[PDB]
Amino acid sequence: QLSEQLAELEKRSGGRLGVAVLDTATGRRIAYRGDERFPMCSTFKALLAAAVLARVDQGKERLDRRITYGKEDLVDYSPVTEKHVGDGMTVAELCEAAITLSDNTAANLLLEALGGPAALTAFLRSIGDEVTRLDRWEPELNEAAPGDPRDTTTPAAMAATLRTLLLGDALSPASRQQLVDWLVANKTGDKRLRAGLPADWRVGDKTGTGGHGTTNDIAVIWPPGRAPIVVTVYLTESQVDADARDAVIAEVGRLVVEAFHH
């Protein structure tokens, strides 16, 4: 039913819509184009922060380590890092900025601390994600060119990977709760999945936005009284405007709510 509603929603979206809903109460998944590749754009920053925290868990990184950088390290969309060229930022502060404000320079500095896009991809391979790949840095990874596999995931693979990292035991309990806290504190998603949820539904999300009419949102959501659900939404090649693409994701939110609580 939800799958058929998503097909109709795609007709209104002006583009190609991919959705996966993973219910951790039952382990059951509902998906629409769930095995098709979509551009991640900034949704990869959730995975980036998880890879940094995995290093912390292994004693190979510290949350309080200070990273210094210069004005020429700055790329566009860097609202937190552009303020701290003088004093630098800690690893924890860069993760917070990358997740909650989608800070691009913060993501590049964290990628540099990992060993780059190829290091993030290998991390994902190590935890059993055979599909997701990061190839480029900020901002070129947002190109979102149709037919280009670079910097892509599938909705089902991303949902499975988020389940493992945020809810399973790939990360330490402190690391997983910290990552969830950053996602719950996200400031960029108010018009997307969040806009489709009732107030008492706890939600952590990470948005992505890029070329070729690409608007994404990935989330973990706790409906009251139950186990959480992981929801990934990818919309690309969409010919409606940015606000309408946001509204498509908010409607996925409403459809999920109605599927799980009637």
Numbering used by the authors: 28 to 58, 60 to 238, 240 to 252, 254 to 292
Give the authors' words:
Here, we explore and test these notions using resurrected Precambrian β-lactamases11 as scaffolds for the engineering of completely new active sites. Of these systems, resurrected Precambrian β-lactamases have been thoroughly characterized in terms of their structure, function and stability. These putative ancestral proteins have been shown to be highly stable and able to efficiently degrade several antibiotics. A hydrophobic-to-ionizable amino acid replacement generates a buried (or partially buried) residue with the perturbed properties that are useful in catalysis and conformational flexibility assists the generation of a completely new active site by facilitating substrate and transition-state binding. We have shown that, when using resurrected Precambrian β-lactamases as scaffolds for protein engineering, a minimalist design approach based on this mechanism leads to levels of catalysis for the Kemp elimination reaction of up to approximately seven orders of magnitude above the rate of the uncatalysed reaction, as well as to significant ester hydrolysis activity.
Consequently, we used NMR relaxation determinations (see Methods section and Supplementary Methods) on the β-lactamase encoded by the most probabilistic sequence at the GNCA node (GNCAMP β-lactamase) to guide our design of a new active site. This putative ancestral protein displays a large number of residues with conformational contribution to the relaxation rates determined by NMR (see the comparison with the modern TEM-1 β-lactamase shown in Fig. 3). A large accumulation of such residues is visually apparent in the region encompassing helix h1 (residues 26–41), helix h11 (residues 271–290) and the loops 225–229 and 252–257. Residue 229 within this region appears as a suitable target for the generation of a new active site through a hydrophobic-to-ionizable residue replacement. A substantially buried and highly conserved tryptophan residue is present at position 229 in both modern and reconstructed Precambrian β-lactamases. In the case of the wild-type enzymes, a clear increase can be seen in the flexibility of residues 252 through to the h11 helix upon moving from TEM-1 and BL to the GNCAMP to GNCA4 β-lactamases, which are the residues that are primarily involved in forming the cavity creating the de novo active site. The flexibility of this region appears indeed to follow the general activity trend described above.
